[PDB]
Design a protein around this ligand. Sequence first.
Ligand SMILES: C[C@@H]1O[C@@H](O[C@H]2C[C@@H](O)[C@]3(CO)[C@H]4[C@H](O)C[C@]5(C)[C@@H](C6=CC(=O)OC6)CC[C@]5(O)[C@@H]4CC[C@]3(O)C2)[C@H](O)[C@H](O)[C@H]1O
Ligand SMILES: CC(C)CCC[C@@H](C)[C@H]1CC[C@H]2[C@@H]3CC=C4C[C@@H](O)CC[C@]4(C)[C@H]3CC[C@]12C
Ligand SMILES: [K+]
Ligand SMILES: [K+]
Ligand SMILES: [K+]
Ligand SMILES: [Mg+2]
Lengths: 265, 992, 38
Amino acid sequence: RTGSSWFKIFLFYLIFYGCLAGIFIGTIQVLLLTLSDFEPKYQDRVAPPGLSHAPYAIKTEISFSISNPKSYESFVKSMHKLMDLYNESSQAGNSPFEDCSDTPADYIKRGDLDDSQGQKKACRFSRMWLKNCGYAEGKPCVVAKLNRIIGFYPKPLKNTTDLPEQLQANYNQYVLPLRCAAREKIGSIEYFGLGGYAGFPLQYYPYYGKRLQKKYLQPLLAIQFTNLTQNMELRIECKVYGENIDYSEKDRFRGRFEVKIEVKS
Amino acid sequence: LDELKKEVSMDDHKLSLDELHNKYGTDLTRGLTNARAKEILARDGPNSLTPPPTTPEWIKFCRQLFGGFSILLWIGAILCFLAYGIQAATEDEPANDNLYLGVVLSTVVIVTGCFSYYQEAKSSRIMDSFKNMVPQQALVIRDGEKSTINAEFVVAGDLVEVKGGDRIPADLRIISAHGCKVDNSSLTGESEPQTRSPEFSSENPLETRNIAFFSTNCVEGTARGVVVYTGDRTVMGRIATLASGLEVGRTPIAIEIEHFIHIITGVAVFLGVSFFILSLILGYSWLEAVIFLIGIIVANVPEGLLATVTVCLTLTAKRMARKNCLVKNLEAVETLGSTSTICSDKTGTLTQNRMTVAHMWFDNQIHEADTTENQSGAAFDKTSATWSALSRIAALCNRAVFQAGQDNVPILKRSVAGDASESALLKCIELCCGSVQGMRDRNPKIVEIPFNSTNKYQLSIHENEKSSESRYLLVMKGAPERILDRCSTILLNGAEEPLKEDMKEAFQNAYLELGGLGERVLGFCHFALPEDKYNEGYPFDADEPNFPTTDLCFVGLMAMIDPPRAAVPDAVGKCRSAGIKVIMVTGDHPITAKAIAKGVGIISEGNETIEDIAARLNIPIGQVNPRDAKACVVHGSDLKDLSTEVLDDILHYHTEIVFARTSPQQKLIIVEGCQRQGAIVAVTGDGVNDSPALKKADIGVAMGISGSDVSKQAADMILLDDNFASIVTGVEEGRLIFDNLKKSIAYTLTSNIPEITPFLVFIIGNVPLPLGTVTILCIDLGTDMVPAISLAYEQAESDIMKRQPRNPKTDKLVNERLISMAYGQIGMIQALGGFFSYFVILAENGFLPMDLIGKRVRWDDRWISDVEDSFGQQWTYEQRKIVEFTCHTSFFISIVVVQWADLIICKTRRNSIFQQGMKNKILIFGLFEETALAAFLSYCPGTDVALRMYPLKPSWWFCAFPYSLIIFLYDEMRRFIIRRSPGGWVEQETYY
Amino acid sequence: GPDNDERFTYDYYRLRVVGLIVAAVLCVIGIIILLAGK
Ligand SMILES: C[C@@H]1O[C@@H](O[C@H]2C[C@@H](O)[C@]3(CO)[C@H]4[C@H](O)C[C@]5(C)[C@@H](C6=CC(=O)OC6)CC[C@]5(O)[C@@H]4CC[C@]3(O)C2)[C@H](O)[C@H](O)[C@H]1O
Ligand SMILES: CC(C)CCC[C@@H](C)[C@H]1CC[C@H]2[C@@H]3CC=C4C[C@@H](O)CC[C@]4(C)[C@H]3CC[C@]12C
Ligand SMILES: [K+]
Ligand SMILES: [K+]
Ligand SMILES: [K+]
Ligand SMILES: [Mg+2]
């Protein structure tokens, strides 16, 4: 508390906090310089991919009434918010999109992570490939996807030893297998994929990242539970497999879901 | 209440013995009846002191449990339970998150309770020390026969008998006494025995010879007296109540802290609410804007600050114990440094309490002996043949003896059997002439006339060691005028000589000068007896002068005094340079008081009392202008008649004050008078008559060895070695730590800012939370601790004894200059250092700063497990969270890195780190151990769940570095300014 | 090539090892300095 001296305070901070914002910004802007536009410096924190899905699960749960239409207007929203993305109206011209193997094929290298070439071209994906999926008002349809990682080639396990879905139409070479499970077998699993299989096609990898590939489209795998059980909380775990895929006791989303469906009506 | 006790006593030594019995329904010769004794008991109550209203054990601990931050921390704990309550009910989130969070906060106080229950303890056993002085039994006469009784059963009226060795059981009127001497040190602080006779001798009850006081002890003789006062109603019974029942009060340091808690609260609630209204303007309800206000507690409340101040206080006290200086209270560590006036008792405090030979007069010359403990002075004379003739009388005409078994202990410290003056002579000769026993053997005593009351002299006759004689020597000593009235000759430099009126005056000079030094004077003379009239086996008559007692050879004078302790004069000098006022306050007589006053420097050369002037000028004192007198010397008998306002003025108007012949209540008044002015006062004393004063001082210091137990109980500090120079040290410590505490407040508070800003910008910028609750506690109860504590080993940045005492009203421990420095400036550079590491971690994991704005809602959205980063990648909940907690971890570490700087710059308030150097090893220890703790919390496995602390990549460690160095430079720059321009700007804005 | 898997690994174990080692050393050094006299 002074007088005719406050001007000696205000003016001080004006060009001291000035000098300091100026230095702080000074150091952000140097740091920023030393990073790729195309690729982060570290990726060991997305290290194995997580598996995420379209139905916005309140708390990993989808309890809803069949005898009510708006008892599930919510989930349908996120479904369409996601699905509106896979429009064939959107994917227009030979640029920047590409028609790819209607059947799961191999990886597609598109050069380096440079801008020496324009936008790296992106494979197409018809939402029609998700036959069957308002969605399932009963016995719901759930859409799965693999979290994008720049330069990540997902590698399906090679058939050598025992494998859960034992060699059943196993596309060993070019598909990343997704199986859903819960003992307690009161469901009816069905899988709408690309070429018909229940996995992700290797022909979408590696992801090249937004700055080099905006409007890129990652695959999907519809999962319909036209089960023969009703009006109870059912705990099902969809999970992906592969060499590059691991799971965690804490990250309950690390390469897998956990859904609490309840078609209560 | 206690004001009545501050008045002096009123009595009945003037009554006749008969009148006294009359007044107490008692018989002088038979004493009370067993019947009337018992009756008079239930009437008045026991001969016993009534214990003071103590303060219980429970309430002592519980009053600390709301010690500022304490209460505020309950508000957090309780409101973090507003979280676990709404959660574990509606939305059961299974965790120890906000439960265990809430818990820590409160039990942070409970265990901390022992630190302020360590800071404000009280050793209050005054009354129990007083109670010890009442004997267990008394000898009364009832129904004409004497019997011993429980001393409590003693009542006003009955006949009591006391003899050498025992304690005065109650206040008595002497009706009969035979050769009775008494020790009244409990009242006067003077121990030399005093006669008791039945005849009243002074209108003053504390001075008359026919009253013997409780809390004193009959030293020799036999006496009988009538009990006039019992239990609480005795002179010293009142002193006990007064001393015991005083209101202790708040110390300076305590008041400095309380004042800091107000400033602290003051900004905790200004920002606390300021981020309720700002949160509201941004779209937050009374469910969100409220949770943040209470939110902004921890960040503002230093949880580690109490503990720090305490360990600092404690660590300083430990050093002073290592200098033979015991402190009973933690708060008492500082007070000596804020002390403006010291009220010192004289005897056994400033002085050694030990009649020592000070000067001699012989060879027509004044000499000065060494009076110090360790005899630090020099040799005065040994050559003179006179000296030895004198020495001879001093050793021979002397009946004192060194108590058995002390060859181990030094002369001046060893206990002697005998009166003070004779012990003085004994210790003098033993010291500078070898064994006195040696002399008393070589010259056997054949007869002597012990010092009479009437003769006013003591002589002996001795066989002379000299074989060529082996004839008879006469030696005598006594009143210097009386020894000259019995002299014909004078041993000058070996040979006798007529006592010319010329010398009869050089003596008379010496006698008056030494007498003026406030010293006790003795005359000495001898006579080599004429062998003719005195055979080898000649008989002498000590009953009737069978020998000459007139016309003897005068040899010399010796003068003695209870002299100052060695370092006292200098100790006084040092305090006065520190701008501290030293006032003597003594129960002793004024001549003696004043003499020592001059001797220890309380009164300086040239200074004068009105009486000095009037004597010099040969005018009346009514005609002296009082303001010409800077010194004064006030007798207790005069002090008694003065109003408190009149004392205040005496206090205002003098620089060199001596209150002499003061009672215990009067020492208290002076102190109260001194405090009334505003001063912080240290009482230093050693007797039961200092108790009320010690107990009233802001800090009471007592003498360890000589100190009575009562003084010791009443004090806050004990000088275990009776080394008064310790006082100087104490003030110097109290000054040092006051400063070094500021430094530790500054250091601790600075990290407040980098801990707060993150949560704010979290709300204001909608970015992910940069630092977490848990992370902050590791800084406050972990990494900042040893650094904070270690600042107490900082030194002086100048000669702090060279500066005046602080004005306690104006010079606060925590001022605005410190908040603007810790908050406005340094803490601000610290926040950016932290925020930088933040942006680095996220930016390097794919979240550039620009995209961070507005995200927290997605980011903290637990249901999104595919948050898209800046590069296009997708993140689960736990994934991104692991990154955030890594940020929490590197932010934590950023602080440490910049607390490095804050530590080195808080090391000094004025000096360059290049001037002060880095000799503080505890501080350096702080840096290493602090960093070791952080590395631990980061890299130790398990601490990623027990504390959500993640490992840091080596590069992470250096983010803050440019910010740590900028702090060093900024501050080193700024104090370089300070020094160059002492007068004005940077100093008046930022100098602590 | 298609076998770039080091791009998603970090040796946190060795970090945690070297971190603790350094912590222990700094810890010790601190003592050595403090106990320069007691
Ligand atoms: C906007 C807000 O953000 C999320 O919660 C935020 C507010 C609140 O909930 C808490 C926990 O209670 C706060 C708490 O309150 C205040 C703090 C004690 C605060 C301090 C101030 C201080 O002085 O020391 C420390 C800084 C962080 C703090 O340690 C926690 C951190 C976790 C958080 O969770 C964060 C939720 O998503 C919430 O639902 C949403 O409303
Ligand atoms: C998160 C951001 C907005 C924090 C910035 C807070 C700033 C504006 C605050 C915090 C600490 C404050 C300073 C600290 C204390 C003092 C000393 C006082 O006698 C006058 C004001 C002054 C000089 C303050 C001015 C404003 C100040 C600098
Ligand atoms: K804090
Ligand atoms: K006191
Ligand atoms: K702090
Ligand atoms: Mg004394």
